[PDB]
Design an enzyme around this catalytic site. Structure first.
Site, PDB file in Angstrom:
ATOM      1  N   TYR B   5      64.365  58.518  32.739  1.00 53.40           N
ATOM      2  CA  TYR B   5      64.605  59.927  33.073  1.00 53.40           C
ATOM      3  C   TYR B   5      66.089  60.265  32.924  1.00 53.40           C
ATOM      4  CZ  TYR B   5      59.872  60.511  35.091  1.00 53.40           C
ATOM      5  OH  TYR B   5      58.514  60.547  35.295  1.00 53.40           O
ATOM      6  N   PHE B   8      66.953  60.896  29.293  1.00 53.15           N
ATOM      7  CA  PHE B   8      66.402  62.184  28.838  1.00 53.15           C
ATOM      8  C   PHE B   8      67.371  63.297  29.243  1.00 53.15           C
ATOM      9  CE2 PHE B   8      61.587  60.961  29.705  1.00 53.15           C
ATOM     10  CZ  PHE B   8      61.545  60.217  28.539  1.00 53.15           C
ATOM     11  N   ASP B 100      48.306  65.381  39.301  1.00 54.25           N
ATOM     12  CA  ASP B 100      48.085  65.448  37.859  1.00 54.25           C
ATOM     13  C   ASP B 100      47.783  66.933  37.630  1.00 54.25           C
ATOM     14  OD1 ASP B 100      47.132  63.398  35.341  1.00 54.25           O
ATOM     15  OD2 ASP B 100      46.429  65.482  35.209  1.00 54.25           O
ATOM     16  N   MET B 101      48.484  67.584  36.671  1.00 57.71           N
ATOM     17  CA  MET B 101      48.316  69.018  36.375  1.00 57.71           C
ATOM     18  C   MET B 101      46.850  69.423  36.090  1.00 57.71           C
ATOM     19  SD  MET B 101      50.267  69.497  32.686  1.00 57.71           S
ATOM     20  CE  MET B 101      51.550  68.397  33.003  1.00 57.71           C
ATOM     21  N   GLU B 116      57.592  69.710  29.224  1.00 59.76           N
ATOM     22  CA  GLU B 116      58.183  68.918  28.153  1.00 59.76           C
ATOM     23  C   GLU B 116      57.363  67.641  28.033  1.00 59.76           C
ATOM     24  OE1 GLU B 116      59.151  66.638  25.867  1.00 59.76           O
ATOM     25  OE2 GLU B 116      61.000  65.943  26.832  1.00 59.76           O
ATOM     26  N   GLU B 125      51.990  62.276  23.199  1.00 63.25           N
ATOM     27  CA  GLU B 125      52.098  62.017  24.646  1.00 63.25           C
ATOM     28  C   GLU B 125      51.005  62.807  25.337  1.00 63.25           C
ATOM     29  OE1 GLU B 125      56.060  62.417  26.354  1.00 63.25           O
ATOM     30  OE2 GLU B 125      56.906  60.944  24.937  1.00 63.25           O
TER      31      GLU B 125
HETATM   32  N1  SFG Z   1      48.969  65.397  33.514  1.00 60.54           N
HETATM   33  C1  SFG Z   1      50.156  65.242  34.110  1.00 60.54           C
HETATM   34  N2  SFG Z   1      50.300  65.674  35.387  1.00 60.54           N
HETATM   35  C2  SFG Z   1      51.535  65.730  35.918  1.00 60.54           C
HETATM   36  N3  SFG Z   1      52.703  65.372  35.365  1.00 60.54           N
HETATM   37  C3  SFG Z   1      52.521  64.891  34.120  1.00 60.54           C
HETATM   38  C4  SFG Z   1      51.315  64.796  33.433  1.00 60.54           C
HETATM   39  N4  SFG Z   1      51.497  64.175  32.204  1.00 60.54           N
HETATM   40  C5  SFG Z   1      52.781  63.902  32.181  1.00 60.54           C
HETATM   41  N5  SFG Z   1      53.458  64.297  33.305  1.00 60.54           N
HETATM   42  C6  SFG Z   1      54.868  64.061  33.605  1.00 60.54           C
HETATM   43  O1  SFG Z   1      55.636  64.805  32.677  1.00 60.54           O
HETATM   44  C7  SFG Z   1      56.931  64.174  32.535  1.00 60.54           C
HETATM   45  C8  SFG Z   1      57.334  64.131  31.069  1.00 60.54           C
HETATM   46  C9  SFG Z   1      58.803  63.735  30.843  1.00 60.54           C
HETATM   47  N6  SFG Z   1      58.974  62.968  29.597  1.00 60.54           N
HETATM   48  C10 SFG Z   1      59.785  64.908  30.888  1.00 60.54           C
HETATM   49  C11 SFG Z   1      60.362  65.143  32.298  1.00 60.54           C
HETATM   50  C12 SFG Z   1      61.371  66.339  32.360  1.00 60.54           C
HETATM   51  N7  SFG Z   1      60.756  67.571  31.845  1.00 60.54           N
HETATM   52  C13 SFG Z   1      62.661  66.006  31.563  1.00 60.54           C
HETATM   53  O2  SFG Z   1      62.962  66.586  30.501  1.00 60.54           O
HETATM   54  O3  SFG Z   1      63.370  65.015  32.130  1.00 60.54           O
HETATM   55  C14 SFG Z   1      56.847  62.815  33.239  1.00 60.54           C
HETATM   56  O4  SFG Z   1      57.570  62.869  34.469  1.00 60.54           O
HETATM   57  C15 SFG Z   1      55.335  62.616  33.448  1.00 60.54           C
HETATM   58  O5  SFG Z   1      55.028  61.863  34.620  1.00 60.54           O
END
Ligand code: SFG
Ligand code: SFG
EC number: 2.1.1.320
Lengths: 307, 318, 309, 318
Positions: B5, B8, B100-101, B116, B125
């Site tokens: 994280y 990112f 989970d969304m 994202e 992803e």
């Molecule tokens: N179905 C889901 N429900 C909830 N969160 C999700 C789901 N799928 C992925 N994520 C989360 O989405 C995030 C994707 C990240 N790569 C981006 C995090 C943030 N937007 C950033 O730019 O740092 C992660 O923290 C995952 O755990």
């Protein structure tokens, strides 16, 4: 040199605790990743719906500090082998929650205690965690030389300490370690954090730990004697073992409160560093073989191959 | 992990683009007369450690509009970061949701959904599946940021990378499994044999009755040189809002954005290509109850075997 | 009101002194800082509001347990391994540190004041039991009788050299400092479920109640027919056991199941309250109105119950 | 396949037991005064090619009671057999439902739910998960047939079977995977080292708030002979209704019932056992979102490794 760490079960503020510990001369800190008293419920309402953050933020330290200065500790209430089903289930969920948080933090090692004979379900939960993703972090199993039941004071009139020499019984803590690692199928990520007691066991008991993957030695402040000048020192028997452990190049962990209150806490580590400085030197062979310790090679064939 | 994280968050270009897209959308939903009279429900789906939450707050303050934020995160570890940020800085304005969304039961419907969930090949992803689940709690007139994404492919020659992939043979698995799976790689010692062409496209919200995220695409790559085909380089492009975009496609690459390296789809056997010949490749996005995966094959100038049938070597867990 | 601006969410202890003033103990078991606090409420209906307290102070570490020492003394079991003594000033508007002695090698989990009120007993996760001289500010005796964490220590109501202790080594020990081997294991018929709480009877000198990890409350007579009498009171572990101030005492039992139960002399249920949304940590009967019972939980609720006597 | 259903149907003892259990339950729900005035909603969950539907009809006619049948089947191939039986013989009395019992939206609630989702180790075909999903459409006072099942284990010595398991080493997988998975086998050349003891028990309906199908069981097997432990034989027992049972446990084996052979849980390394010693084994029933599996280990006289951790060698798909 000697690599040293401070063990605590009380970290009010993470930043100053780390800072104070570093100021004492320690290379790392063994601390809880969740409050040791903060028992959590995963199944039953209304306690399972407890809000607020479950622990302190990862943002309190740099990624490098988490990776290099912190050894995680399993909460003392987590009992995966409890005879109570409800305790067993919450403890499985809590163990995973804690081991996963340590993974999130990128902690270099995590401490788990072998304080009883049956740790079968603890072994199962840890093997499932090992087989879930990567294979970086170490797991340090906290096992004493002498079981707590075998070092208790003979102060219970209707339950006296056994005065019969039990050769196999004095070696019970090794079988607790052996059973656990056999169950986890000799995982390279599973090592020993060996806890030294006030009274050293018989030589045979110590010798059992020969060949075992000892990565840490836990020294309680309560095993230290006091010299003329009022400083913490060790018995000659204890010193002998420290010298044997220094040949294995283990990391030393100082646990417990200051029992020499008139002196600074760093005096315990200063003593340890003195034993490290006053150890026999490496001979011509010990100098040559340095770097080849337990390094496997194919035996040479000068007849079949041209050297 | 926390370090993943943290890396990112080292890409400012990404969040400055997201902030700008949210800001622009806020002005199009709330006119200057309704400025501080109407409050917009904004839901950050997959909030991570919260940089998108802060981007949504910076955007609402710069637009001079009223927003009520929801920060949805499944990862309980990241939830600890979120709940600590909430209590210390955000306050009641931000509601942290550990769910989970797709499973979350929303109290209100959303005006804007910000996410994202994009990979190097956009949808790898499983951004489509995730956003499709969450679609129900978006108001009819609701906006999804990003609104659209498209993956891109181009044939590549690279004997070094072919050798690197080969060296991924592992014990206890199909001796050719390594060729039936993508690799995120900063392609250095390679040759692009033809221009990138769009592969798969997704749009949000998905306003169609029988929603199908499965795809089959045929790509014809004119080759003007004599060469050997070793695989396919994959990139993506996304439309956050209107002209606010993010791209890893080399010709349109977002300047200074290092959040995604390209993807590489290898082929088990190198394919000889003559000048003037066309390379024809077929890609499929497949799925079942529990998994999503890609399957691919080269049909021109010669055929290859269908790579990764039934996701036998590589799957993306739902 | 010369005290900390905010009191920590996790309330650990509630104790009423003679006049009816309420002593509170709290810890922050989550967030940035893991510390504690001590509070006095002359108006117990104002609790836990920080702006309506008589006195308040911040402790360096968390409060695992506390006990009143007379009318102005506060003895604290700390996460730091320290046993702390605090004292209310002349006006009773300031809580001031008398001593903070770091003697235990782990969290001090339990504390009880002996009959004399000049001596105290502490139990710890370090497996030791310590006898303290409160006036001399020293450890008189250190006992390593248990083989696991010491969950509970309960000093005898009238015998100054007598106390009970229970541990995760499944032992319930009866102590008498007069003997050369002071501890005696009280056999709970066979092995069983771990003992979690202890309470001496206020009238019957050789009678005590004990709670287990499984939610069962048992009644023991030191000199009876080997086996006792029990009742499955809770679905989860019995955290605490408190007797009422009545001539004929009623027993309050609190659990991790988030409920309060009030039982009679034969362990049968008279009252039950599910007011708490988190773990019930302490219970204290009002000295003024004996039908009142205050409970504190990790939900930050100070609940006053109207017990039907 | 059609041939697999055809061989299940060759066991009359099984359906005569099911018919009898349905008949007995019908008389306990409808008294002789309400005979042909009250109609009982009966749902056959996992109806197959329909032998349980015919058993439920034979039972209603012999009891002289009124029944409205639903035949739920997920397998579309078996649905063709069902829909043809329905049209040709059953009529409007039987409603054929092509659905997973967990996904099905029922028009009415059921008085009785009849199923045969049992494996050789009872719950290994995931009867608990399936019936838990379907539980919602059963009336409060509703009966599940079977009401209960229990798996049983006993330690076995057999050098022939150890050699047979060993010979299951396959290319492209863990070289010891074969020891971390059960086998349905008609055990012939073997020795039972101790008496079978119950392992896991399930009851239907599951009247508890936090329903958990996960289990951990410790079994202590007194051994009166010197021997070598090569694995564990698994059997089951079920209560269809009251005293109407079905068993593959050798001592109580239902006469003439060949629908289930025993199961064998091997161990990677043979374990020496002396006379008077106890064999201690631990079995775990585990699960996640998508899979269910068993894990097992021997802790006495010596330890074994935990077999099949995380279901790495063997899983049951949800
Ligand atoms: N179905 C889901 N429900 C909830 N969160 C999700 C789901 N799928 C992925 N994520 C989360 O989405 C995030 C994707 C990240 N790569 C981006 C995090 C943030 N937007 C950033 O730019 O740092 C992660 O923290 C995952 O755990
Ligand atoms: N969740 C499910 N939904 C619907 N049917 C199911 C489910 N799980 C299993 N089944 C069916 O249940 C049947 C189980 C059979 N072994 C028994 C069939 C029939 N009772 C007989 O004795 O021939 C199969 O036809 C499965 O397809």
């Amino acid at each position: 040199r000697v690599s040293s760490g401070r063990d605590l079960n009380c970290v009010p503020e993470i930043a100053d605790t780390l800072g104070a510990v570093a100021k004492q001369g320690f290379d790392f800190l063994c601390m809880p990743v969740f409050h040791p008293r903060f028992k959590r419920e995963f199944i039953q309402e209304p306690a399972k719906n407890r809000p607020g953050p479950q622990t302190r933020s990862d943002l309190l330290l740099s990624g490098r500090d988490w990776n290099t200065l912190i050894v995680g500790k399993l909460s003392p209430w987590i009992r995966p082998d409890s005879k109570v089903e409800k305790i067993r289930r919450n403890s499985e969920a809590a163990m995973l929650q804690e081991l996963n948080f340590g993974a999130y933090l990128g902690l270099p090692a995590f401490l788990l205690p072998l304080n009883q004979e049956d740790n079968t379900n603890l072994a199962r939960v840890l093997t499932n965690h090992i087989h879930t993703g990567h294979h970086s972090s170490m797991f340090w199993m906290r096992v004493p030389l002498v079981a707590p039941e075998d070092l208790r004071d003979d102060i219970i009139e209707n339950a006296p300490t056994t005065h019969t020499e039990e050769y196999s019984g004095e070696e019970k803590t090794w079988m607790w370690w052996h059973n656990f690692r056999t169950l986890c199928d000799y995982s390279k990520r599973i090592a020993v954090a060996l806890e030294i007691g006030a009274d050293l066991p018989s030589n045979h008991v110590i010798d059992r730990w020969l060949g075992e993957p000892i990565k840490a030695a836990i020294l309680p402040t309560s095993i230290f004697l006091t010299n003329k000048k009022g400083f913490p020192v060790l018995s000659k028997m204890h010193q002998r073992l420290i010298f044997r452990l220094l040949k294995l190049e283990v990391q030393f962990i100082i646990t417990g409160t200051n029992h020499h209150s008139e002196k600074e806490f760093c005096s315990y580590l200063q003593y340890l560093e003195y034993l490290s400085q006053n150890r026999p030197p490496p001979n011509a062979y010990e100098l040559f073989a340095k770097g080849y310790e337990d390094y496997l090679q194919s035996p040479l064939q000068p007849l079949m191959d041209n050297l | 992990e926390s370090q993943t994280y943290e890396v990112f968050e080292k890409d400012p270009i990404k969040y400055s683009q997201y902030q700008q897209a949210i800001y622009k959308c806020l002005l199009d939903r709330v006119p200057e007369e309704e400025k501080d009279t109407n409050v917009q429900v904004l839901m950050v789906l997959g909030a991570g450690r919260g940089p998108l939450v802060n981007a949504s707050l910076r955007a609402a303050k710069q637009a001079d509009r009223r927003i009520k934020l929801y920060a949805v995160e499944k990862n309980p570890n990241a939830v600890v970061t979120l709940e600590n940020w909430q209590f210390e800085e955000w306050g009641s304005q931000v509601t942290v949701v550990s769910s989970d969304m797709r499973e979350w039961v929303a109290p209100e419907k959303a005006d804007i959904i910000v996410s994202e969930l994009l990979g190097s090949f956009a949808d790898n992803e499983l951004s489509p599946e995730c956003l499709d689940g969450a679609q129900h709690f978006l108001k009819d007139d609701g906006v999804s940021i990003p609104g659209e994404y498209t993956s891109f492919l181009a044939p590549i020659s690279s004997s070094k990378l072919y050798n690197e992939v080969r060296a991924c043979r592992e014990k206890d698995r199909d001796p050719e499994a390594q060729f039936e799976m993508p690799y995120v790689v900063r392609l250095h010692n390679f040759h692009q044999l033809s221009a990138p062409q769009p592969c798969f496209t997704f749009s949000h919200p998905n306003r169609d009755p029988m929603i199908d995220n499965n795809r089959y695409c045929t790509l014809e790559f004119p080759v003007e040189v004599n060469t050997v085909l070793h695989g396919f380089a994959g990139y993506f492009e996304t439309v956050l809002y209107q002209d606010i975009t993010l791209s890893i496609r080399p010709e349109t690459h977002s300047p200074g954005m290092f959040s995604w390296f390209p993807i590489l789809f290898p082929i088990k056997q190198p394919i000889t290509v003559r000048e003037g010949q066309t390379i024809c490749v077929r890609f499929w996005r497949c799925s079942n109850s529990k998994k999503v995966w890609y399957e691919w094959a080269v049909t021109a100038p010669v055929c290859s075997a269908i790579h990764n049938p039934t996701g036998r070597s590589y799957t993306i867990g739902l | 009101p010369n005290a900390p601006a905010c009191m920590e969410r996790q309330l650990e202890a509630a104790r009423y002194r003679s006049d009816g003033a309420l002593l509170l103990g709290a810890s922050s078991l989550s967030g940035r800082c893991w510390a504690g606090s001590l509070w006095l409420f002359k108006d117990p209906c104002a609790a836990p509001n920080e702006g309506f307290c008589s006195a308040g102070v911040q402790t360096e570490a968390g409060v695992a347990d506390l006990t009143w020492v007379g009318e102005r003394g506060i003895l604290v079991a700390s996460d730091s391994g320290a046993v702390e003594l605090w004292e209310l000033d002349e006006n009773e508007t300031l809580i001031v540190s008398k001593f903070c002695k770091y003697e235990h090698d782990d969290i001090v989990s339990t504390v009880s004041v002996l009959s004399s009120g000049t001596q105290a007993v502490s139990g710890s996760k370090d497996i030791c039991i310590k006898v303290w001289d409160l006036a001399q500010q020293v450890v008189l005796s250190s006992y390593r009788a248990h083989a696991a964490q010491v969950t509970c220590v309960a000093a005898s109501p009238h015998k100054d050299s007598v106390f009970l202790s229970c541990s995760e080594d499944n032992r319930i020990l009866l102590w008498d400092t007069r003997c050369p081997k002071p501890a005696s294991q009280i056999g709970c018929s066979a092995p069983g479920y771990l003992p979690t709480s202890l309470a001496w009877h206020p009238q019957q000198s050789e009678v005590f109640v004990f709670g287990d990890e499984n939610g069962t409350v048992s009644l023991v007579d030191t000199k009876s027919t080997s086996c006792v009498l029990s009742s499955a009171v809770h679905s989860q572990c019995v955290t605490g056991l408190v007797f009422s101030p009545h001539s004929v005492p009623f027993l309050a039992s609190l659990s991790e199941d988030c409920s309060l139960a009030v039982l009679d002399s034969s362990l049968s249920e008279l009252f039950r309250s599910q007011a708490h949304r988190d773990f019930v940590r302490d219970a204290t009967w009002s000295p003024l109105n004996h039908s009142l019972l205050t409970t504190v939980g990790w939900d930050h609720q100070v609940v006053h119950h109207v017990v039907p006597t």
